[model samples]
Target: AMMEIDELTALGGLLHDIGKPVQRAGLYSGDHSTQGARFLRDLAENTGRAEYELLSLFSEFNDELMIRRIKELSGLTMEDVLNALWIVYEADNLASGQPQASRPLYSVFNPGKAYPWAELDFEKELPVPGDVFSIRSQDYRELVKRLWEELSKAKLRSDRLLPVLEKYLTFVSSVTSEGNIISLYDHMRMTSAIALAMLRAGCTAERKEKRFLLIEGDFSGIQDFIYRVSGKGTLKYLRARSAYLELIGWDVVLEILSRLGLTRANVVFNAGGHFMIIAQNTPDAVKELEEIRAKAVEWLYREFESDLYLAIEWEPVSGREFGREGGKNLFAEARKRLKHKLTVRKLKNLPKLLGFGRTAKNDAGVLVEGPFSGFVPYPVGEQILVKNTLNPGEIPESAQFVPYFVADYFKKDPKGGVATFEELSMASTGTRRLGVMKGDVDRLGEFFSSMDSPSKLATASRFMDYFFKGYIGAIIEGKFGYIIGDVPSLRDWPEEPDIVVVYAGGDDFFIVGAWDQIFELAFRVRRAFNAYTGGKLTLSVGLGYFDERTPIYRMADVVSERLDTAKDEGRNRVFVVGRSRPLDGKHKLSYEWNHYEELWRTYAPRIYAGNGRLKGKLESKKGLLWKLLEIRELYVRDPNDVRWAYLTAYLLGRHGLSDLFPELVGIDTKAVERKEPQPVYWVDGVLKIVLMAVRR
Candidate 1:
């Protein structure tokens, strides 16, 4: 029977590429379709799962019988799955723009300087459909070429990027080979738009009786899957293997939905071991989702000998679930219920992966030892620190699927790569300080459900993800031109290990770099985010500056808190505090993100640009910047006080620079106009910029 051209069946087609991540050079067949089918076959065999009556959906490992196999297992020969994959095939072609048109190869960086792999010619047409079976070394090289263009444009230290470039290329080459697509992100977005079109057309309703389904998969023990703390009280080895496991978990749900003849819009968020699925609501769907839930739990335990479980829950979504306009999120009630299901009280303990070596302990303190799945490649929680003995060759066949595996560049010789922070600082030409920043898109949940159509939804998601995941490193590194501040030296400033992408994907990120570069990056990321969303979206950021001796986790935790604090005060703000700030200390300060941007536009140039007029005089005063910090703190403590105003007024008159009084120095009148402004509201940021200029 010819399948109905339906979105439900197309959903399974959209997921045709899930097995790409697990395919390696010599593992099973190089065909991702066969590789993906084999994964479910293993799940069914290992777990003895009761709900996999549809396990035969993955029975055919043959590419030629794709449609026949899908029908044989589920009894539906409707071309839904076949047509869905074809539509995605066309969608993939279109997503990269003109399919036959040659894609870019060599990007123009600073002319006359050599870029990594500069000798290779890069101009080449994208893969034609059906070329998926014949991907070769040249195709992998093409993927590498794309990354090099981005890397060179960002001016990232080649030494820094070269370390991880090879391994990352291998992963991209293999994963993209099965589908012959540009990237996982592009494939997902393209298929999402295609699937949505089918869904809305076939599932449309004019009446108010229609409802949406919010399917959320929460992995209960994500930290255990990603890494474990060592005896030294730090996350030592990063298990890249967990990344592939996470991907497979997501695929299992999609495969089940495919057999059930359902399609979800997209995984709104898929990182840090949690993923969310949005789909059309139906009566039988929940039962199938539960069956998927059962299989996910049993498979993880049986195959990997691990206790990680995929928690699946679904909630009815409609305008009835929305908050009173402007007061709450569109899916607030649905999310509230989902959040409750995610709570510890509502969850059961899976055997947790205890500290290293396949050791696990349950809630009842029963300890068990299992064989280690050496799929993990690097140290957990840290890109820079790994044990000396970790062998790169030991990473399992599934290592290509791990998302965070890209973070650890030192796999070849774990003990050696970059120098110590202070060692690099001593070799630097600027301040020996580092900044840690954490941030994410605000109101993302609202934005995803707010869009009226799948195209609109994909557009919005792609725009934000493009900035965060794809180009943010380049943007932060000034590849798109220095849009952050007007400082002259900053553009040409030279430093090895300039900025490190600690981890970035989905909506959130953590980055570390030289103090001033990272400070500027916060502003750029916020500005770029705002511009991309048409000023409709805002970001919450937490920033910290630390000396070399500080622990990366502590820095990470503090910045995360600052990000949380920014959200608490308002949706769009930034928090910056001392790295060594006390646990109970009120050393933190929050401000509207725009506050610094506004100040830098006027104050940054005056301090550093031209003949260096104002900064020279101020720097000679030694304690002037320090005093400004004191006044800002005082105003924060007592906004009602005139002491901050008096000090500012005195400074305006004391410096012959009074001509720039309210505009560039002394005080920002814009803050005063807000009525809620502290007299020294943005002085710290302004003063920091001044120091960067004068000290340089």
Candidate 2:
């Protein structure tokens, strides 16, 4: 279904900013657009080059723009070539969105106003012009009208291009409210989707187009849902329970969307526990959403035994709604209308209960005598309060299908006893000590705000998502699954470590596992996240160790507190100690992820081997770590003094020899003024990480 439009032009629109990564990496010069165009030329000219092939990793587009742009420049009469190029240029501009209330620059869709396009002299004096005009025109209506004329000349039907264009703009505007990353991402993905959708909708009159319904599925009663206690109340238990409850809501909403034939594209943005979807505007679609709410309430009660509520608002829109000339500013208006409805909708209060069963006489003014069923689902005949009687393994299969981190605890024990993480951990891994970790991205607010354009923001968001929601888990699984890493150091690691994923979405995660595995997992997660964000983004983690006797809820709360400490102290640090300590206004042993990585590589082997801890020296304490911890304050106050002097003293004191120590220190670490002393810190946290890596 290749339309008359240039495939390379469409591709150029999607990849116009490809050079940003390269330019930022300091591997090349020129801004993103220039570098991207140059890169395209190289790929097109160098036929079958390795770098050319690498472009295929992100997209299937050939480097045709290499030859296409050349032909336009060579021929003074740039009729057909300019037509394609204008679309790429204009699409990139329009995706930036409408003029905002602030000083309009990069945020606006008008590239002519935002950038200097005077260098492209074709507009000043055009040859062989057949309805060809400036793509950077201020009036979108006039521009789109002219664009359709050009497309019609290329033998392409204009109607196909219209829908994708409309939806694409609608999507970017809708998600930008979440901030930049998602907003920009919707631009790149939807740009591609629009281009490809146009290709699919060739000049066949029989192919009718479908429209979209923008639906915001917002929920309420979160504070009440999390704070209301049912049984044993510990901070750890409550938070763990809160996180699990949040997951159930996410599962139900996703289930509802999936049932309605909505793809991930329809899911404009999903942050926290709420989400938005671009559902089909067919008859009864809203009815289906209502049914989902009823079903979700029933299931949420069946599992966590809590009262939560969900609200949904939607609007139907067409292609011209996004157009300023032919259509209205329907995109922005739709959002406002939806928000108004969502604001007015009343949240249901707690469910009322009727007293007594049939055996008891009705009370005065009572309508009927019945026991409070409490909302248990089918076949769950009783509200049993016995702690041991609850089974993590025997929940209804329907509930099982929508499993979260704590789902297994709902299962009935074979002996009909309730299973807890404490019991489950010892039964699985043979160790009472467990590790709980809470982690999230650093400076997320700034990062999102810096995303000025859709593509840039989308790229950043997608990059972060790879770690937080995707690859961090894969890396750990591979290490244990024998699917990738084969480090002998981890050979004795548990095949099935009892890591409980309390929650993971957006840019954060919470997990609990055996002490050793959890410690190892934390470092690995940080390292993977480091590589994923290309060092531009980093993670701050808080980890706590507990024995089987410690409550799960308590451990979660403790680790969460530690995580906040890391965040409060300039972020990108980890706070991990045997027991809780006061905030003390700063990170005590916290250090950057890269600092920890380098320090462990440089010093761990020496510390562990010198202490005779490596060669079956199992009886000694973590004296090497203890020794380093004694000097945490010194390094914090003066990194330079410790960089060469104190660090050298430790190195010489431990192993008393090093072939690469001189070379390592002389590696010109100074990136600032000589006296300013830009030295790496964190010998304290280094020892902590190594202890976890090497300790018996």
Candidate 3:
């Protein structure tokens, strides 16, 4: 059978830029288009696929006779090659949106500068101004050679080719011209999406008006859907539920793409319960989208009732709207339209949602059986397979099964298995409690709205997703060790990670684990995030410690509220304490991530050190930290209570080490005497967590 036009255009759009890297490597002696065409021709020859040879005409700039000859040689019609090649060429120009000379790709993390020509290293890389090695042919050659070796192994189909390109081309520059910030991978992916969209929309070579559709899908009530489980089997239920939602997301996205004759490239981003796709703005495509939405909603309603809703909306966009300077506003407008549509939809569907109700019952009016009645989790190696449809089976049809990463730790099990909630909680150091941490990119909407071009937006989204989707798992598994900075890796972790990645993708993550390990994990993630974004982007996190038997829904609810508080109080903060009774008083305390770090760095060692002065002095006075906490509590109860300060001084003075820790003493004294808020209110919460971590 002849190759489909959709596949042809996707391949052409993706491979069109492969020449830039090849030419930069000094292995080719022509402009990117020319070199890239030659690369495809050679790849076709090596792979023995004559159809790929037809793509070389994309670089010929529409030489009719040459295109005709290549089309005939490839056993394809002239119109097929002409339309496919034209769409690819047009997509390249549209994705670039500007013209300039060969320069290094300015880092997205630090715009107006370039990173060294290296493979992706999230931890050890940063953008610099004018690095000679960044533009060197020698470095480019090594990258290109390795890339070629991998490409040689891939099947020449678009689905197979995409992953190989992503792995190597992600860090390579799309254009080294005039403030180059877009990655080669994103450019190629967007190009492929645009090309397939044009083909599906029936845009001919001579079409004067080019248009596309921007489709955005977001899940409502995700928090309730993921949490709100019974206390029994909470861990498994939480894991399975989170995994199910992600699978549903993929199923919906893939279904839309399939109906539109599009591939994964058409998907802009899919994570954090939201996704966007670029498609041809054709009536048929719109109809298909509506049909898919209705079917998906029906399925979701049946399984989850009103607990989950997928809101999908699309807007028509002109090709000119993708221009570099104008694209930002256009993209923002499209998002606003989609958001408004989603809101209207929710309002209109409220009656249906309420009418449907939540309880799942059988035809006989009996409540459904099984912990997860509608869906079942079937573990397969590192992935867990869940049925996308309402079916019970060890394996269903290919399309009915969806796989997701399994984040579990089994004590004393070498091969690893899922652990119980009680088992995980017992892993905690002192209190035998579970810790939940939820975090997301700060000002993510503002960040995306600030992009100056479609490619830049794609690049930014891709990198942000990489941190959560790709690197977060590594960090949790201790692949990068305890610290992810200038410091060497600290391998002082258990053989298996004690944490579970309940859900992590898009621009955010939710994880649960041993209370102490969870605290350390949050810091590790933040440190890695800082390095990954070059300290330009910020992440906000919320942490909550709970008794092992706490209801999963309550745990999720409290942690989510804490996360919101972190965002509200000021982004880039972590709400570590949530109204602790022992820490004293009803007031809650949160800290700027760095401020918390400073407090931990200053006091944790003093209290934990075996031979340190503070620990040695306090060893004789058992519960000194607790007594100090009580003193702070007294001050918290009444700021006018001068007795609290005098009592703190006398308590420490009797131990003959009052001068050793004047800062602690001064914090209370200054608050009472100077009538200033205590700068170290966080001291109590921080000390409490530390004490809990080390308690017997």
Candidate 4:
């Protein structure tokens, strides 16, 4: 519903600071908006003009007052404040429809939007993650240090990271007094790795291949990635994005280093007239390092007016190199004449790789014909080290690529490479969720039966604003079948779609067109709204569906339910109504089942008094999933209780008990294929995450 400009302005300003605890009269009070407003009003009493300027805080909640002060100091007029408020409503955190947390500016519902104004309550929720308000690039590494310290408040293990991995898996799902397990930590890492790999290979992206990654995570998580990549593990993948995870900030890096399994590794840069000496092996080594460091610092100070931070680790004091097997002799050093590159020789050398396109095989001396691979007996490269210029395990045996600064390589690699990546889906089928039908939708549709509460209007105009022209309108008309109301109208849909899916959110409900025919229903619903509320009762919709051969995961899920929620909560919305397989189980849907499966196996049941391997049907938890592993394992164990136990575990996992088992979110569930059916429906199971963020 569109409010008058004044009302809108008041609304924007009033709600702007809702997130803050008010502070009044400069005292220790609760909810500073009231106090802030009062404080500003006190200033206004002296400088009389309608200080409506200060009232602008209602535009949207801003944790930082930078924007507010900028507005206040700009010296704008009262009516100007109103216009600005309008913008704030349109662009700011007004609609929780999409991740609306980006800007505080507002945008009103335009002419194309057809929605009923009255009988609405709220637009969207506040404090969502995707909102620009909360989309901060954080220092994930630091979070790990804190987590490690906290975990130390728990226990220790050789694989320092293993404990946190356990905690990660157990935290979300356990919901019990018994402590979470350590196995989950491993599961989370494994799943994430798988997911990354899948995505790098273009398994997820609809477009091109990916070769790099800009990791967005909290502190400890970032540290985990970094340590796994750059630190001691220095396991450079084919590309930096494919292997290394760069946190948005350095704080995370330092924090992770502060935690476990890390010591500092620094470098000192120096330059002299013609040549420079890099050293190791003496108290003077520190002095030499510092002198070089100081010189670079001086140059930077004079040239760029900035001090440089320099640290270094000198070479070994003895004539030896550290190897996984044993220490080896560093015979001597040699100078190559032409290239001017220093050549250092040592004994018992390892094979190395030139690049992805080259291969080494047959004692490494045999260079086979191929692009980027080799299975040599020795002395040649085996695998391409994409990141970090040096690696003790492979090629450079000195330094490898970092994906970011691999200059010797010709072309820029893709965002994330297939060779060194993995992905993990954390979605699960929830067992706790009730049936599809909602009493509210039935009731609201009944209200639409009269348009007037006294009569049934078949709609209360819950999420009509979300309707796009084609699909949403069509679904309503078909579902309406017939409409009886004040000046009622009838619409027979010309286009009948193959499928129809009705989903509910809270008390509101939405019927997906499932096919184009649904649009006719939408048009009729619009007519009914006009007749009932005199253009106030609307059945808005949003439509986006799938083609015949589309994958189940490709089709959007929860769109109708989300839109329906939007409508009843003050947003007129109708998301895409896809026509395809019957939505009963066919229309793509994501649930919490996998999460439970992981919890029971990875964190809970697996933590038994004594067990070899917890055997149960993970897929049984979710109504539909691949269940080959369990079927095979259970082939020998023939107790009805055992089968029931397996079934029970599956039920718990498939249901919404995930908070009791967060670690299982991205676990990969293997599938069983029955050849009798030929190309059997081999639907694998895995955990996935569903987080709805409001877009401003």
Question: Which runs of model 2 end up more than 4 angstroms from their true locations?
Answer: 1-213, 218-265, 269-272, 279-432, 443-472, 479-494, 533-537, 576-589, 609-612, 615-628, 631-681, 689-696
Worst 10 residues of 4 by lDDT: 687-696
- Score each candidate by Cα lDDT: 0.45, 0.43, 0.65, 0.25
Better of 2 and 4 by lDDT: 2
Candidate that would win on TM-score: 3
| TM-score preference between candidates 1 and 2, better one | 1
User: Scored by Cα lDDT, where does model 2 land?
Assistant: 0.43
Task: Compute the lDDT for candidate 4.
Answer: 0.25
Please give the distance, in angstroms, between residue 123's alpha carbon in candidate 4 and its true position after superposition: 32
- lDDT string, candidate 1, 166-251, tens digits: 22331232122222223343344435434453344344221223445666666665434433322232222222333344335435
RMSD of each: 14.2, 18.1, 7.3, 29.9
Listed in order, each prediction's TM-score against the native is 0.53, 0.46, 0.84, 0.18
Which has the higher lDDT value, candidate number 2 or candidate number 3? 3
| Best candidate according to lDDT | 3
The TM-score of candidate 2 is 0.46
Rank by lDDT (best first):
3, 1, 2, 4
Name the regions of candidate 3 deviating beyond 4 angstroms.
60-72, 98-104, 120-133, 207-210, 324-328, 347-416, 479-492, 579-588, 610-614, 640-642, 667-676
lDDT by residue (533-595, candidate 2, tens digit) is 434567788878776666555566777778887787679887755422223333354545555
Ranking by TM-score: 3, 1, 2, 4
